[PDB]
XYZ file of N, CA, C and O in Angstrom:
332
model
N -16.421 -63.669 86.872
C -15.348 -62.682 86.566
C -15.691 -61.941 85.272
O -15.101 -62.176 84.236
N -16.640 -61.048 85.324
C -17.020 -60.293 84.097
C -15.799 -59.538 83.564
O -14.826 -59.356 84.270
N -15.892 -59.122 82.330
C -14.823 -58.382 81.651
C -14.725 -56.966 82.224
O -13.658 -56.498 82.569
N -15.830 -56.280 82.328
C -15.796 -54.897 82.881
C -15.215 -54.925 84.298
O -14.673 -53.947 84.773
N -15.322 -56.037 84.978
C -14.774 -56.119 86.361
C -13.250 -56.241 86.295
O -12.530 -55.524 86.964
N -12.751 -57.143 85.494
C -11.274 -57.308 85.386
C -10.641 -55.962 85.026
O -9.520 -55.673 85.396
N -11.355 -55.135 84.311
C -10.805 -53.810 83.931
C -10.932 -52.869 85.133
O -10.086 -52.030 85.373
N -11.986 -53.011 85.889
C -12.181 -52.137 87.080
C -11.098 -52.429 88.126
O -10.852 -51.633 89.008
N -10.450 -53.562 88.043
C -9.390 -53.885 89.039
C -8.143 -53.040 88.761
O -7.372 -52.746 89.652
N -7.937 -52.647 87.533
C -6.737 -51.824 87.204
C -7.054 -50.342 87.418
O -6.352 -49.644 88.121
N -8.103 -49.856 86.813
C -8.459 -48.418 86.981
C -8.742 -48.127 88.457
O -8.531 -47.030 88.931
N -9.225 -49.100 89.182
C -9.531 -48.888 90.628
C -8.282 -48.419 91.384
O -8.370 -47.659 92.328
N -7.122 -48.868 90.989
C -5.878 -48.445 91.700
C -5.553 -46.986 91.376
O -4.960 -46.284 92.170
N -5.935 -46.520 90.221
C -5.643 -45.102 89.862
C -6.653 -44.179 90.552
O -6.404 -43.004 90.736
N -7.789 -44.697 90.940
C -8.805 -43.845 91.619
C -8.228 -43.299 92.924
O -8.084 -42.105 93.101
N -7.894 -44.163 93.844
C -7.327 -43.689 95.137
C -8.376 -42.863 95.891
O -9.516 -42.752 95.478
N -7.993 -42.283 96.996
C -8.953 -41.463 97.789
C -9.459 -40.279 96.955
O -10.466 -39.679 97.273
N -8.776 -39.929 95.896
C -9.236 -38.781 95.064
C -10.583 -39.119 94.417
O -11.579 -38.466 94.655
N -10.618 -40.135 93.598
C -11.898 -40.514 92.934
C -12.950 -40.849 93.991
O -14.065 -40.376 93.933
N -12.612 -41.665 94.953
C -13.607 -42.025 96.002
C -14.190 -40.756 96.629
O -15.331 -40.727 97.038
N -13.417 -39.711 96.711
C -13.928 -38.449 97.318
C -15.006 -37.828 96.423
O -16.122 -37.604 96.847
N -14.680 -37.544 95.193
C -15.684 -36.930 94.277
C -16.891 -37.860 94.114
O -17.991 -37.539 94.520
N -16.691 -39.000 93.514
C -17.813 -39.962 93.302
C -18.593 -40.192 94.602
O -19.758 -40.531 94.574
N -17.975 -40.015 95.739
C -18.717 -40.232 97.015
C -19.747 -39.112 97.202
O -20.918 -39.360 97.408
N -19.318 -37.881 97.131
C -20.273 -36.749 97.303
C -21.414 -36.879 96.292
O -22.575 -36.882 96.648
N -21.093 -36.985 95.031
C -22.158 -37.114 93.997
C -22.931 -38.423 94.201
O -24.050 -38.567 93.746
N -22.351 -39.379 94.879
C -23.064 -40.669 95.103
C -24.194 -40.457 96.110
O -25.207 -41.126 96.073
N -24.028 -39.529 97.012
C -25.092 -39.268 98.024
C -26.420 -39.005 97.311
O -27.452 -39.521 97.690
N -26.404 -38.203 96.282
C -27.667 -37.909 95.549
C -27.679 -38.668 94.222
O -28.012 -38.123 93.189
N -27.318 -39.922 94.240
C -27.311 -40.709 92.974
C -27.367 -42.204 93.295
O -28.335 -42.876 93.000
N -26.335 -42.733 93.896
C -26.333 -44.184 94.231
C -27.145 -44.420 95.506
O -28.239 -44.948 95.468
N -26.621 -44.032 96.638
C -27.365 -44.237 97.912
C -26.408 -44.072 99.094
O -25.313 -44.598 99.097
N -26.812 -43.344 100.099
C -25.925 -43.145 101.280
C -25.727 -44.480 102.001
O -24.636 -44.815 102.417
N -26.774 -45.242 102.156
C -26.645 -46.553 102.852
C -25.640 -47.434 102.107
O -24.853 -48.139 102.707
N -25.659 -47.400 100.803
C -24.704 -48.238 100.023
C -23.279 -47.725 100.241
O -22.331 -48.486 100.263
N -23.118 -46.441 100.402
C -21.754 -45.882 100.618
C -21.225 -46.337 101.979
O -20.035 -46.487 102.174
N -22.097 -46.558 102.924
C -21.638 -47.004 104.269
C -20.785 -48.266 104.125
O -19.897 -48.520 104.914
N -21.046 -49.059 103.121
C -20.249 -50.303 102.927
C -19.111 -50.036 101.938
O -18.069 -50.658 101.995
N -19.301 -49.113 101.031
C -18.229 -48.807 100.041
C -16.929 -48.484 100.781
O -16.930 -47.843 101.812
N -15.817 -48.924 100.260
C -14.515 -48.645 100.929
C -13.459 -48.342 99.866
O -12.719 -47.384 99.964
N -13.387 -49.154 98.847
C -12.384 -48.917 97.772
C -13.113 -48.652 96.454
O -14.282 -48.318 96.438
N -12.438 -48.796 95.348
C -13.101 -48.551 94.037
C -13.907 -49.787 93.634
O -15.025 -49.688 93.170
N -13.347 -50.953 93.809
C -14.077 -52.197 93.437
C -15.330 -52.360 94.307
O -16.224 -53.111 93.975
N -15.410 -51.669 95.415
C -16.616 -51.803 96.283
C -17.809 -51.136 95.594
O -18.811 -51.765 95.320
N -17.707 -49.866 95.312
C -18.832 -49.156 94.639
C -19.129 -49.819 93.290
O -20.265 -49.903 92.868
N -18.119 -50.288 92.608
C -18.350 -50.942 91.287
C -19.055 -52.287 91.490
O -19.779 -52.753 90.633
N -18.850 -52.914 92.614
C -19.506 -54.229 92.867
C -20.986 -54.014 93.195
O -21.827 -54.831 92.874
N -21.312 -52.924 93.833
C -22.738 -52.663 94.180
C -23.519 -52.305 92.914
O -24.548 -52.882 92.624
N -23.039 -51.357 92.158
C -23.754 -50.963 90.910
C -23.941 -52.193 90.021
O -25.037 -52.509 89.602
N -22.878 -52.893 89.730
C -22.995 -54.102 88.868
C -24.016 -55.066 89.476
O -24.675 -55.810 88.776
N -24.155 -55.059 90.773
C -25.135 -55.974 91.423
C -26.529 -55.721 90.847
O -27.139 -56.595 90.264
N -27.040 -54.530 91.005
C -28.393 -54.223 90.467
C -28.630 -52.711 90.511
O -29.146 -52.181 91.474
N -28.256 -52.013 89.474
C -28.459 -50.536 89.456
C -28.198 -50.003 88.046
O -29.107 -49.604 87.346
N -26.963 -49.994 87.625
C -26.644 -49.486 86.261
C -25.167 -49.742 85.954
O -24.369 -48.828 85.891
N -24.797 -50.979 85.763
C -23.371 -51.294 85.462
C -23.267 -52.728 84.942
O -23.566 -53.675 85.643
N -22.844 -52.898 83.719
C -22.722 -54.274 83.158
C -22.006 -54.208 81.804
O -21.966 -53.169 81.178
N -21.460 -55.326 81.395
C -20.738 -55.440 80.123
C -21.572 -54.840 78.987
O -22.398 -55.505 78.394
N -21.361 -53.590 78.680
C -22.144 -52.952 77.582
C -23.218 -52.041 78.180
O -24.316 -51.944 77.670
N -22.910 -51.372 79.257
C -23.914 -50.468 79.885
C -23.300 -49.797 81.116
O -23.867 -49.809 82.190
N -22.143 -49.211 80.967
C -21.492 -48.539 82.127
C -21.439 -47.031 81.873
O -20.487 -46.364 82.229
N -22.455 -46.489 81.260
C -22.464 -45.025 80.981
C -22.608 -44.250 82.295
O -22.151 -43.132 82.417
N -23.239 -44.835 83.275
C -23.412 -44.128 84.577
C -22.054 -43.977 85.269
O -21.628 -42.884 85.588
N -21.374 -45.065 85.506
C -20.048 -44.984 86.180
C -19.113 -44.062 85.392
O -18.564 -43.119 85.924
N -18.926 -44.328 84.128
C -18.023 -43.468 83.311
C -18.461 -42.004 83.413
O -17.663 -41.100 83.267
N -19.718 -41.759 83.660
C -20.192 -40.349 83.767
C -19.582 -39.700 85.011
O -19.038 -38.614 84.955
N -19.667 -40.357 86.135
C -19.094 -39.780 87.383
C -17.600 -39.504 87.180
O -17.089 -38.470 87.570
N -16.895 -40.417 86.570
C -15.440 -40.196 86.344
C -15.264 -38.964 85.459
O -14.314 -38.218 85.593
N -16.181 -38.742 84.556
C -16.076 -37.555 83.666
C -16.192 -36.291 84.518
O -15.594 -35.275 84.229
N -16.959 -36.354 85.574
C -17.118 -35.164 86.456
C -15.781 -34.861 87.135
O -15.384 -33.720 87.259
N -15.079 -35.874 87.573
C -13.764 -35.631 88.238
C -12.770 -35.050 87.218
O -11.734 -34.534 87.584
N -13.073 -35.140 85.941
C -12.150 -34.605 84.898
C -10.931 -35.524 84.785
O -9.850 -35.099 84.432
N -11.103 -36.787 85.078
C -9.960 -37.739 84.983
C -10.059 -38.512 83.666
O -10.741 -39.514 83.573
N -9.389 -38.052 82.647
C -9.449 -38.755 81.335
C -8.497 -39.959 81.327
O -8.620 -40.843 80.506
N -7.545 -40.005 82.221
C -6.599 -41.160 82.235
C -7.324 -42.426 82.701
O -7.083 -43.507 82.200
N -8.209 -42.304 83.650
C -8.945 -43.510 84.134
C -10.223 -43.653 83.319
O -10.519 -44.698 82.771
N -10.983 -42.600 83.243
C -12.255 -42.644 82.471
C -11.974 -43.142 81.048
O -12.824 -43.730 80.409
N -10.790 -42.914 80.541
C -10.477 -43.382 79.160
C -10.467 -44.912 79.125
O -10.988 -45.521 78.216
N -9.876 -45.536 80.107
C -9.832 -47.025 80.125
C -11.247 -47.585 80.301
O -11.604 -48.588 79.716
N -12.055 -46.947 81.103
C -13.444 -47.447 81.316
C -14.178 -47.527 79.976
O -14.560 -48.590 79.527
N -14.381 -46.410 79.336
C -15.093 -46.417 78.024
C -14.217 -47.055 76.936
O -14.680 -47.336 75.848
N -12.959 -47.288 77.208
C -12.081 -47.902 76.173
C -12.336 -49.410 76.108
O -12.185 -50.025 75.072
N -12.717 -50.010 77.202
C -12.975 -51.478 77.196
C -13.971 -51.831 76.086
O -13.994 -52.942 75.594
N -14.798 -50.901 75.690
C -15.789 -51.197 74.616
C -15.451 -50.405 73.347
O -15.874 -50.754 72.263
């Protein structure tokens, strides 16, 4: 139960189909289309990146970057706020 994960459980509810929509399109040319086939909610994409890509306690600049593209400072604020 990493710390960045316990925080992703709260911000994940604010994402909704809105965040999943933006981060999904940009994910095609960034994370991986095959990985999106399994992605379903917010904790899904966050579980894959943390697995082995670019996401960990003290290194979530990639995820927070995509949220910055959606222009969502209410959620993106909590992400970079954890540190």
